Design a protein around this ligand. Structure first.
Ligand SMILES: OC[C@H]1O[C@@H](c2ncc(-c3ccccc3)[nH]2)[C@H](O)[C@@H](O)[C@@H]1O
Ligand SMILES: OC[C@H]1O[C@@H](c2ncc(-c3ccccc3)[nH]2)[C@H](O)[C@@H](O)[C@@H]1O
Ligand SMILES: *Cc1c(COP(=O)(O)O)cnc(C)c1O
Ligand SMILES: *Cc1c(COP(=O)(O)O)cnc(C)c1O
Lengths: 810, 810
């Protein structure tokens, strides 16, 4: 059908059809008389998977022979989404599979919808890791993603009576065809125990053992025949575990719980023992695998030449003391030499400055769980602080500020400080964020070792986030500039030559309109909700958080509603306002925000005076597969975090690539997006970081805004009085109280500028041609935000390896 | 190589080789440079499995079209053992696979040893169910085995310092290629709750739900292209289960524990809640499946014409009240009609008369777990006792004896009484056992309904238990009488014509000698133990129990040792005495017996005066795969249970078929074995059932035997004084005390006759030709003990269906 989807050759189509039938019979043990759509999905998945195998084996053989430097990306989260379409895209099989299934009487798009997301992450951080794996394969790096195979990923969200309910994501129920269990490479991981000091070193003894069993998933690069590995560990009890008899067998669940469930907090630290066990489990199993592979190449001098470990935030920070443990206690290196190797091997990426998100573990937990690691951390701390003391003599407050050990009621270890001390490079994830790190929370460290600090602005893969989810847009682009841009996104700059081209303008607008119709149909079909596809699609999709300010959007929506009710017969640009995202189950305020959004919808969507000029929809169960549907359909991307709080954002980049305009604060990567596109082509509003600092210095008083802005006072009085909750008039009192007296994120301070900026959005939407021209200017300058760019920078500036676009032989 | 193993055609061998290579690459994702023997085993298993698929689909299609009466065999245990060789045997692929693997440079026997037993049973009862499934497929019956897929089967036994240790049997660790998960046919099962009485019937409400997910395993018939199904249920929590958040997800293990582990008791009742949950889980899921299949053929009159349910002991007895529940509460049949259907559908097999093995559940457990079922059982009981009262008016003691409800400290439900009331047929498992049932524990029921009571003497499948484990013997038989006997074992009678044939005599003895050499090599290789292959191999393998009297064997062994020490320079026939079997983990006396056997070995095996004239070996981890090795190697089969205690025995039959002579009491099927072969060709000793009754009437006094038999007194004094435990002289005091004062199984009473009979064994072994002739007379008369005979009797006399030997098309 469309060019970028590859060839449908007769030989290939014939072969796919016979292999589909073979799997249906032999693999699934079904015949066509009783097979369901799910069986058909599985038959196609196995058929496509077979095409990965030769390339997977050959890639891994190639790395064994050539022995390149290996990159190990450690993360507690990999938010992969679905695999079938991505695999077809990267192997150039999409049109052939479409044809084959068509000839068998099946609709491939319908089969694609059966696949479960692999939801092994919370949001941005987990999805970044997934985009990174795609880029590393596409750039030919010998890279491995290491994580935990959670039995239950991020919960499925149901909305009941306007409230979030959680249900378990039993994603493995029907089986996962994309992983390969590797029980033969199972490794032991130790917990608890005690340390004995002998004549020749410390010994960690009397430990409890849990086994780590690996499952490998292939990660195909884009049309280069490279297939890298994501290895995820699963917890298993040893067979003599607890070994009256029946109870001992049932108690194996105590060990196996380590990999049972993903902690569902986004940008928040919950200091529970089970989470710490997860963090050590992934690190301990991974490092044995790394060392095994290194020895199969005595001399650890070369370790940093052959190994890079990248820590995705502090979650795998125990890699640092674990590597020291292994080198010192087991390989018998002297401390100084072990430390040199460790520092040169490890690098740390910071993804947040919010204090409630920073990991600070109680010493007593580490003392009990990981006694040798605590000893090592103390020794690291003493030696580090000796360096600080020599560099800044007499500066005793610096010593307390920089210590890895925080004093107080409960002593804690600051894991971010540990990562900086033990890494040769520390980066933030957007230019403003990296600058904030050097100016504020890591200022002391930057003064001591300025060379360590870098920036690596985040990106997204244009395979998943354009070609896969928006084939219509990919095609009209390819018609003009060819296909090379899919792995070299900077080529989209060539589209600036088409900003006055009437045909291109028409095609860009038609693709958006088709995406909007398709999404509006999806809504009716799966959720019996009826929306106007000619309205402006105004979307904020992301995790629910105070700092992301879904509440500010809410205030705007109520303002629009009140303005309509005040002058019903005046024309306003029609909007469909869509807000979606999950709240952490324990985060009461975030759950209240969801209820507020649905409550606003209940009033607005049923007011006959409003008609279809304003609709407010809560998009349930936002996840990667839903992002792939809604983002291509959006007109306006809401990126409205308080300046200084969103380290980067990546949803922002997805919307830019897909032909939405952005309304946003100068926060995270929004700053670089505006710089690339031009400030004239971006709807920027609100306080900058320096304005937030000025407000904090004199003191934020929300009452001042309430007193001076009548439209804002009206809304607060409506909330307080029960206008949006007639049967429970005091329902939103927690929200009002927070806004009025302890709002850390200054919602009222950006309200006026936000509403005024939204008026400018509506004015531009009234002129379709000029709206579309501004869109073309955004799409054309989105190239910087490819994760191929990001990964090439990590490769050259941190890992010391050169990317390659050269094909392996097929 | 050998005839009965089928053809090795060039086309077939070529095809097997290419499919082996295909699976190795695509299924296992390995190349030949890194593949291990385990990968090679899996490649062969997938290759052989592919040959089952077409026949499996076609068989099940055939039953859908023809709609025969379906037989459902319900059991808590299916002791399947390994599947690879059995599958090759039944599909006539053994020689082709041997050739294919040979050409690939692999030894197929070595690959076969990698497969784990499916150990989903304790011993005889579980293995009977497995032999039955093989026979039902071989006889063309539309039969389904339904059970529980335990995550952990019977424990692996380790011997440490002479003591049994248990370790978990993690049989699924590397995956099970023989099962097919069928998550799409998952069914709900209810627990707890309460009963509400409405205008139109009872309602069971407020229940907790656990899901039952089926896994299907193919059961191939012998060369008839029939492939039946064994469906095993696995417990899954619903996704809203318990739905702070993390704990709710972790607590899913509470529901999933139902299928976690097999209770490891043989012929013993442990009345625990988890066991009751297992019993209901299998019954409830199975009956929904049965009813679904029946409706896909409103009129339940025809149900008994289309369905037979066979209860393997009382473990699935809840089928009776569950079927009533469904028919009355859900389908709204009147009680009398529902009862008629239930009785005509269900049949019960009893496998034990030991009081400690009979299931009697406390009413309070059923009250809490299964409140509606208790109500139904009470109603069954009232209506049944009304029938008793009308038949035997005024006999009030009969009413109390026959009641389903046992009065006492705790009221209990007698499940055997429930099964008899609700079944149209009740059978024992050997003629003497069936007679005991009518004379003793079920006498009252027999008087009320004599027509219900039958006998079905047990059997064993000659596919696994001759062709597979003893190909050498199968071959020399086939050379004389052809291959037809493998599915018509009565043809072995033709071998009586060869009892004076010098060539046949030589071949039978050579096959035994080769089996003994092979087993002696296995011992050294895997357990560094050195045995004399010219000695008489004297073997007792079976679960450790007081009633099976491993202790009586022990007394004989010590007697032989003491006789040697008394006259060292006299000739005695050399013996290797092998005893193996698992003890239930909670069964203290059985664990002490294991320790006694190893302690005797420690003394005997290291006494230089004994030399290699007597060796005592404890065979560790006895299980189906070990039985397949040791049974072909045995000379003498020890079947020495106290008369009246072993309902049938099936090991006895395995030894007979494989060329061992039997020393045994007249118990269980030993009686029929002696009758078939001739008493002259069997070493029979000891009390008959009527002698045991006479002793019980006057009172068993063990001291009398101690006082009159000096050889016996010597042994007891050795045990008591610490001769077999120097460092712990009082180690065996529990054993001595039991023997002397509370031996329910009268070990001393059979001692003299046993020792004298063993002397006759030794005398015959000195004459190889006459020993071998007696062997031929046993093998030749073993035909009755095929489970094909057994199943044809169930089919004709209980289920009302005709067996068929006709091939389905391939
Ligand atoms: O760099 C990728 C993204 O990482 C998010 C992130 N930081 C910390 C976490 C986090 C902490 C604890 C548990 C789970 C996730 N998540 C930031 O909020 C985004 O701005 C950023 O675009
Ligand atoms: O009929 C097959 C075999 O069944 C055994 C048996 N009866 C009850 C059980 C039993 C009870 C509770 C839990 C597990 C197993 N096992 C008998 O002891 C054998 O004689 C007989 O040959
Ligand atoms: C991209 C993405 C995110 C991150 O969005 P932000 O707006 O940067 O927070 C979160 N969730 C899902 C499912 C995503 O695809
Ligand atoms: C046949 C068999 C049994 C039953 O043996 P009996 O001597 O009848 O108790 C027990 N266990 C295994 C592994 C068997 O193969």
């Amino acid at each position: 059908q469309i060019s970028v989807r590859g060839l449908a050759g007769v030989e290939n189509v014939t072969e796919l059809k016979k292999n589909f039938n073979r799997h249906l019979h032999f693999t699934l043990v079904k015949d066509r008389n009783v097979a369901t759509p799910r069986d058909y999905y599985f038959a196609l998945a196995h058929t496509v998977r077979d095409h990965l195998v030769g390339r997977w084996i050959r890639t891994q053989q190639h790395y064994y022979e050539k022995d390149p430097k290996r990159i190990y990306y450690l993360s507690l989260e990999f938010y992969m989404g679905r695999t079938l379409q991505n695999t077809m895209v990267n192997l150039a099989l999409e049109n052939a599979c479409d044809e084959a299934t068509y000839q068998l009487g099946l609709d491939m798009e319908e089969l694609e919808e059966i696949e479960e997301d692999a939801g092994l992450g919370n949001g941005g951080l987990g999805r970044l890791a997934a985009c990174f794996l795609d880029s590393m394969a596409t750039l030919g790096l010998a890279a491995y993603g290491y994580g935990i195979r959670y039995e239950f990923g991020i919960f499925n969200q149901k909305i009941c009576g306007g409230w979030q309910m959680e249900e378990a994501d039993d994603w493995l129920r029907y089986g996962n065809p994309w992983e390969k269990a590797r029980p033969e490479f199972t490794l032991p991981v130790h917990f608890y125990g005690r340390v004995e000091h002998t004549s020749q070193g410390a010994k960690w003894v009397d430990t409890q053992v849990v086994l780590a069993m690996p499952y490998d998933t292939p990660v195909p690069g884009y049309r280069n025949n490279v297939v890298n590995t994501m290895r995820l560990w699963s917890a298993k009890a040893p067979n003599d575990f607890n070994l009256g008899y029946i109870q001992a067998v049932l108690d194996r669940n105590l060990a196996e719980n380590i990999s049972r469930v993903l902690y569902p907090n986004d940008n928040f630290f919950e200091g529970k023992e089970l989470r710490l066990k997860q963090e050590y489990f992934v690190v301990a199993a991974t490092l044995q695998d790394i060392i095994r592979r290194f020895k199969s190449s005595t001399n650890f001098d070369a370790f940093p030449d052959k190994v890079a470990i990248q820590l995705n935030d502090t979650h795998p920070s125990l890699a640092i003391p674990e590597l020291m443990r292994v080198l010192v206690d087991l390989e018998r290196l002297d401390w100084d030499k072990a430390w040199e190797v460790t520092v040169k091997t490890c690098a740390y990426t910071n993804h947040t400055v919010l204090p409630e998100a920073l990991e600070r573990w109680p010493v007593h937990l580490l003392e009990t769980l990981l006694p040798r690691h605590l000893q090592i951390i103390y020794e690291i701390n003493q030696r580090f602080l000796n360096r600080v003391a020599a560099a800044f003599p007499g500066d005793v407050d610096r010593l307390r500020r920089m210590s890895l050990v925080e004093e107080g009621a409960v002593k804690r270890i600051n894991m971010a400080h540990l990562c900086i001390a033990g890494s040769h490079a520390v980066n933030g994830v957007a230019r403003i964020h990296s600058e904030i790190l050097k100016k504020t929370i890591f200022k002391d460290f930057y003064e001591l070792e300025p060379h360590k600090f870098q920036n690596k602005t985040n990106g997204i893969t244009p395979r998943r986030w354009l070609v896969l989810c928006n084939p219509g847009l990919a095609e009209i682009i390819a018609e003009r500039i060819g296909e090379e841009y899919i792995s070299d996104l900077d080529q989209l700059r060539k589209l600036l030559s088409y900003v006055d081209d009437e045909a291109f303008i028409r095609d860009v607008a038609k693709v958006k309109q088709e995406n909007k119709l398709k999404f509006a149909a999806y809504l009716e079909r799966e959720y019996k909700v009826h929306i106007n596809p000619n309205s402006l699609f105004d979307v904020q999709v992301k995790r629910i958080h105070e700092y992301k300010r879904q509440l500010l959007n809410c205030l705007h929506v109520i303002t629009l509603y009140n303005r309509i009710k005040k002058e019903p017969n005046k024309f306003v640009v029609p909007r469909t306002v869509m807000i979606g995202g999950k709240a952490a189950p324990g985060y009461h305020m975030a759950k209240m925000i969801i209820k507020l959004i649905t409550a606003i919808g209940d009033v607005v969507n049923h007011d006959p005076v409003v008609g279809d000029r304003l609709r407010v929809i809560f998009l349930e169960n936002y996840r990667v597969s839903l992002a792939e549907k809604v983002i291509p359909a959006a007109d306006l991307s809401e990126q409205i975090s308080t300046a200084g709080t969103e380290a980067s954002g990546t949803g922002n980049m997805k919307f830019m690539l897909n032909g939405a305009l952005t309304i946003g604060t100068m926060d995270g990567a929004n700053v670089e997006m505006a710089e690339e596109a031009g400030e004239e082509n971006f709807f920027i509003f609100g306080m900058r970081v320096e304005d937030v600092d000025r407000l904090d210095q004199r003191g934020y008083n929300a009452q001042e805004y309430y007193d001076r802005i009548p439209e804002l006072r009206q809304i607060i009085e409506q909330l307080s009085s029960g206008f949006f909750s007639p049967k429970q008039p005091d329902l939103f009192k927690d929200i009002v109280n927070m806004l009025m007296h302890h709002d850390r994120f200054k919602v009222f301070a950006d309200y006026e500028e936000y509403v005024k900026c939204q008026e400018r959005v509506s004015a531009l939407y009234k002129n379709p041609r000029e709206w579309t021209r501004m869109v073309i200017r955004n799409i054309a300058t989105s190239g910087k935000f490819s994760s191929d760019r990001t990964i090439a920078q990590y490769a050259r500036e941190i890992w010391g390896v050169e990317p390659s676009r050269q094909r392996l032989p097929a």
